[PDB]
């Protein structure tokens, strides 16, 4: 009932579900005057203010339907193509054959047709002589036209629609002057046209229900469009009451007289008491329930342009799940048919429609959510459109069809787009990873946590709080870094803060008590504190090769003073993430040389004395193409990994020079001028210094990006790899949009082993943020689902994985809540789920 839907604001589709795809007639057919066709209201509206040629290329459209394999195909009948004047006399000879041969082949192909009698292409004679929907004599003319199609087409058509979105016919045809006939600002004609459009449907329904439904046994309804709206405040009720009045004004306008009680909503009658026409109580009984089902439209026609709806100062939304929830509550749980759904793409997107995959992915995800979870009686879904066509006042500037059609080509070949392949698999499956592993980790596995820059034995206050945090965990290791600018403030070995080195020694010595073998990081840059000593940053920072020489002097200082207890060393922590901070390759050039000098200083002098291991931690985010149907994304998927992992790997692991794929691609951009930068070419000596300067592999893996292709402009680093990233609102994301994708680490641990031989691998940073501070359910799901994947690679792919370090042991007051402990160092529930996996050593 009306007014009840306001409470909405507070994985396989069912069998025998109707998968289909629909078009119009003015957008797709073309040939507006061939074979003695009458002029439509738009034909005069276009020529005063070809196309897809589907009227002649029907066999090419039949092949397109067999590709997707749809159960139904929604098309409208051009009223002036049968009767040029609208008066039912005798249909056109050639025009009748088109819809006859169309309905014949669809039944031959087991494609049940769904026909709409009016799709905004009204004959110009009824608009010129009578006046269109302003004069009410057309009500019995549309009923006459409906009778003709009920006779000669009713035997093959068992699903009929009267008007396709009558809200736009009145509001945009007589209010905004956007659609045909195009009259801006006519309050009278708007609600009068909306009146006749409701009365014309009821006459056609009672016609079919009493004169053709007995011997044809079909259905008839009306496609009503709407939008969705969210309040500017969840707690506010007036902001929610304003949303209820918004949906009523656009959806309840045509649904209450048809699906509700036979009259306009109470809010509409009260708002426009003297403008909205009156439904006699005799009319109310002859209109309530004139719909066998509830055809529904949810496309860009009720969202774009901005003047389409009245937002009442609230936020617009595209959530289809709650849109059907409002329909199921306001109209006594009907059986809905989404007769139109999908967004659009610009004309520049030929057949590489990447967003259309993820736009369709949300809707079907929300439709399935409505069916299986919200108990919405949806029995069908209509994709829109089947092929690109004339999109009304937008002309050919946008593309909404699932088949690309070159409008400048004479053959008009329908080439399937990226959404056609995705939608076909959606239909074939009627609705990427692996199950659980069930196995134990090795007893020599390094369970670790991780801190960050710890600015400065039990007398130290900050150590006591951190020492009480490493007691609840059963971690075997502890990863943290040192403030380079706090031991050598001058950046030279003359000034040695002996108090700061004594503080760090008391950290590890107190850790040696607790049994947590430490892993110290000499350098840890970020956006907050860059870390470089002030004289070094004053002297060009990392852009001067003397800073790398200053790192070796600082490295050996920590090696001698801390190598007694520390047996695991990390030089730089995520140096690949310095690009965000040609003028970056040279900076990373010194970051690579500084690592070697810090590693050669340990391998020769301090390795036999202390007997440890030294390496560096790299940003190890896995990548995958954003469109598995566009090849340019597959090649760019590895191009991201080469520009990220191999940038600091092939030198320090394998060859000694930069990755050739990264080195050769940058030159191709500079070849035609795109980049004014060049990757430095190394000599025999520098490559001989960097080669094999690691004792293991360390990775900073958090999530998985979806790279796609684009000719990025600029001479910066991001413009050198020609890559753009796509966020998927379907997949479970984090508060900071970290897409929780577990199967990315397995494909990464497999990529490292294949590329850089069989070495020991360590996961030095793996975590997730969550707004929760006491029951971080996202982290436990993130931790368990990710720890499930590293076990899969160990026991199946035989990857030498030996350590796992959770990202943050604690967080800051205004920092992203990435830690396992609160700002006040209170234990979240994530610690105890970690101990369950550490004590169990995996999942038995």
């Amino acid at each position: 009932f009306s007014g009840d839907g306001r409470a909405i604001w507070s994985d396989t589709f069912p069998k025998n579900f109707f998968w289909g795809i629909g078009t119009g007639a003015l957008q797709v057919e073309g040939s507006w005057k061939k074979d003695g066709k009458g002029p439509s209201i738009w034909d005069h509206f276009i020529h005063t203010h070809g196309s897809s040629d589907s009227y002649i290329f029907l066999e090419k459209d039949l092949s397109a339907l067999d590709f997707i394999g749809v159960s139904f195909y929604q098309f409208s009948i051009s009223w002036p193509r049968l009767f040029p004047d609208g008066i039912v006399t005798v249909a056109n000879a050639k025009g009748l054959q088109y819809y006859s041969t169309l309905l014949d082949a669809l039944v031959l192909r087991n494609i049940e047709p769904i026909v709409t009698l009016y799709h905004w292409d009204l004959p110009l004679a009824l608009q010129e002589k009578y006046g269109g929907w302003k004069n009410d004599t057309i009500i019995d003319i549309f009923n006459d036209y409906a009778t003709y199609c009920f006779q000669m087409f009713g035997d093959r058509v068992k699903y009929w629609i009267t008007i396709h979105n009558p809200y736009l016919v009145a509001w945009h045809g007589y209010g905004t002057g956007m659609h045909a006939p195009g009259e801006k600002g006519n309050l009278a004609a708007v609600y009068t046209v909306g009146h006749n459009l409701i009365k014309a449907h009821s006459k056609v329904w009672h016609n079919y229900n009493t004169h053709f439904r007995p011997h044809q046994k079909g259905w008839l309804s009306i496609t009503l469009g709407s939008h969705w709206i969210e309040p500017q405040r969840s707690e506010n009720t007036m902001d929610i009451f304003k949303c209820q009045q918004s949906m009523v004004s656009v959806l309840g306008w045509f649904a209450n007289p048809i699906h509700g009680d036979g009259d306009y909503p109470e809010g509409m009658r009260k708002k426009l008491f003297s403008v909205l026409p009156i439904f006699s109580e005799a009319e109310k009984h002859e209109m309530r329930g004139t719909a066998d089902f509830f055809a529904f439209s949810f496309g860009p026609n009720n969202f774009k342009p901005l003047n389409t709806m009245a937002k009442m100062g609230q936020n617009v939304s595209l959530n289809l799940r709650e849109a059907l929830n409002w329909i199921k509550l306001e109209y006594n749980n009907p059986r809905i048919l989404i007769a139109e759904n999908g967004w659009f793409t610009d004309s520049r997107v030929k057949t590489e429609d990447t967003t259309a995959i993820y736009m369709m992915k949300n809707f079907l995800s929300q439709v399935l959510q409505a069916i299986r979870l919200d108990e919405i009686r949806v029995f069908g879904y209509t994709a829109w459109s089947l092929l690109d066509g004339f999109e009304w006042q937008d002309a050919y500037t946008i593309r909404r069809g699932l088949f690309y059609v070159d409008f400048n080509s004479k053959q008009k070949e329908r080439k399937p787009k990226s959404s056609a392949h995705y939608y076909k698999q959606i239909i074939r499956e009627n609705g990427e990873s692996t199950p659980d592993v069930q196995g134990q980790f090795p007893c020599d596995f390094s369970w670790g946590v991780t801190e960050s820059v710890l600015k400065p034995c039990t007398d130290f206050v900050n150590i006591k709080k951190q020492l009480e945090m490493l007691a609840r965990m059963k971690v075997t290791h502890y990863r943290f870094a040192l403030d380079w600018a706090s031991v050598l403030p001058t950046g030279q070995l003359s000034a040695v803060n002996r108090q700061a080195l004594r503080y760090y020694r008391c950290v590890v010595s107190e850790g040696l008590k607790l049994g947590i073998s430490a892993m110290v990081t000499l350098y840890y840059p970020t956006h907050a504190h860059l870390g470089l000593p002030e004289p070094l940053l004053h002297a060009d920072g990392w852009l001067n090769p003397s800073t790398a020489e200053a790192f070796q002097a600082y490295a050996g200082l920590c090696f001698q003073e801390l190598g007694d207890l520390v047996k695991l060393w990390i030089t730089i922590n995520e140096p690949n993430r310095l690009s965000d901070i040609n003028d970056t390759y040279g900076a990373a050039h010194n970051l690579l040389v500084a690592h070697a000098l810090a590693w050669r200083l340990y391998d020769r002098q301090f390795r036999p004395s202390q007997r440890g291991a030294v390496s560096l931690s790299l940003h190890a985010d896995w990548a995958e193409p954003a469109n598995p149907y566009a090849d340019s994304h597959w090649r760019a998927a590895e191009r991201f990994l080469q520009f990220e992992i191999a940038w600091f790997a092939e030198p320090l692991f394998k060859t000694g020079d930069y990755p050739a794929a990264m080195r050769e691609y940058i030159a191709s951009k500079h070849r035609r001028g795109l980049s004014s930068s060049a990757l430095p070419r190394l000599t025999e000596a520098e490559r001989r210094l960097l080669k094999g300067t690691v004792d293991f592999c360390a990775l900073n893996h958090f999530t998985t990006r979806f790279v796609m292709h684009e000719q990025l402009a600029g001479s910066r680093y991001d413009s050198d790899r020609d890559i753009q990233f796509l966020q998927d609102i379907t997949r479970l994301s984090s508060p900071t949009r970290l897409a929780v994708i577990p199967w990315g680490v397995r494909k990464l641990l497999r990529w490292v082993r294949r590329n850089y031989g069989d070495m020991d691998i360590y996961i030095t940073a793996s975590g997730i943020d969550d707004q929760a501070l006491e029951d971080d359910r996202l982290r436990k799901y993130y931790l368990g689902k990710y720890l499930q994947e590293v076990l899969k690679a160990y026991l199946i792919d035989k990857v030498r994985i030996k350590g796992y370090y959770a990202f943050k042991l604690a967080e800051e007051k205004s920092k992203p809540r990435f830690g396992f402990f609160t700002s006040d160092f209170k234990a979240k529930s994530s610690i105890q789920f970690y101990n369950k996996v550490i004590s169990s050593r995996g999942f038995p």
Binding site: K304, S317, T355, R577, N700, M708, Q727, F807
Partner: peptide, 19 residues
């Protein structure tokens, strides 16, 4: 802030590191 005037109304296409 859904931008219903473009083909991407969710801002899916395109920015830091958790470290």
């Amino acid at each position: 802030p859904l931008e219903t005037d473009s083909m991407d109304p969710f801002g899916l296409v395109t920015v830091r590191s958790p470290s």
